[PDB]
Symmetry: C2
Subunit: 241 residues, 2 copies
Amino acid sequence: MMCWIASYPKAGGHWLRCMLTSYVTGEPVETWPGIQAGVPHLEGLLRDGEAPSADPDEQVLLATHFTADRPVLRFYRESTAKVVCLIRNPRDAMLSLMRMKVEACRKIAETFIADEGFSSVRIWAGEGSWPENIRSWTDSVHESFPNAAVLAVRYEDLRKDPEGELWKVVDFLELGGRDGVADAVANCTLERMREMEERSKLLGLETTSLKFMGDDIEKAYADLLHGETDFAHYARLYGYA
Amino acid sequence: MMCWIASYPKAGGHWLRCMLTSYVTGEPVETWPGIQAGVPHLEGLLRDGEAPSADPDEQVLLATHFTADRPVLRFYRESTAKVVCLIRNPRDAMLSLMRMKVEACRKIAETFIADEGFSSVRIWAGEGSWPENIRSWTDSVHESFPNAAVLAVRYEDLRKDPEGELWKVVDFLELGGRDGVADAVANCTLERMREMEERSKLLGLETTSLKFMGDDIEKAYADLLHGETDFAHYARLYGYA
């Protein structure tokens, strides 16, 4: 049975794949390759010319930023049982983009707001816009995975209660007991994460506030935000009003 | 029926895909996307979450640098009819790497010579070494494409006689008459190529001598070159002694 950790880029997917790994592993993990090993990232596999077998007879966890309707996923149409769809406040994704990427912002925000996401950003591909992505993995999901049940979780909820919010993913994914959760929440940390990334870069190895600028932007973001356009729909729904 | 233009990176694959396109197109092509359209590059498709259907009922041309044994190619096991395997003097691939990438060289050459290719180069993935790549697409080809016939062509031969050397690919690929060949050879040029690349970068759009350093390197390259190790085998065979 095939299981996706699906997410728009920068929705906190690394952080989540960290936790799911060190829970399944049991051991803490330091090396980032250790995470690609626990919850491999489809894009990465494909870049190597790997593609996981369709119809594994034991459970596999794969993570991706692809839209559920991407044709390369059609190989997994019948074998997909579960989807964990991880969601974040889109406003944060922008900051997360600058955070890693003031004239520079009041226009990327326009592109983002025109994009309704990161479509112009060459870093990722196949992700569509933020709402097209959420839809494909939630409400329109059976159009590309008809056997699948979905559990959505917000970055915002995982941060305010990491333990409980994780167990839900664990239990949903029927990965075992509620016991490992704390020690698994423990080794992944907005600090210990930053550290794990560091070691791995250094060894070589493969790796990885609004108005402070706005004023004029704000009136446009909030128009997108409260504006009967699928983005706003999904903002309304996952509490980003 | 599925057809590959297979090549080690920097074997002149863009140049060849240019020609095959403007022959099938008929029109000259300026824009690089125009080439991705004529002979799409599997890696690129996959980066978007596209994957061409297995068992097309009309002929498709796809280009790739993957080893023929990469698991993602297994979808094409039975539907592959033909392979054009494009080969270049490995020594040139090194220069081609520096050319786009003197302390800097006498060690990349060591890595290349230790690699027997570009395995350490993060630009490409899944290509294996130069001889593993050639083997997979030539002599060991039926291990991953059992219905396939193969025609090998050398960059070196395409440069000294572009017209005739192309017709052979055309005829082999049963793409039509010998007539378009010259006008198709014509629009692709070690100059007009450089120009096409330029326009496309500028518009935005997606795009792309030994001893002068050696002495000490030379004695190691030629040891690899005349040294009963599969590299030398394939050097012996395609005339790089």
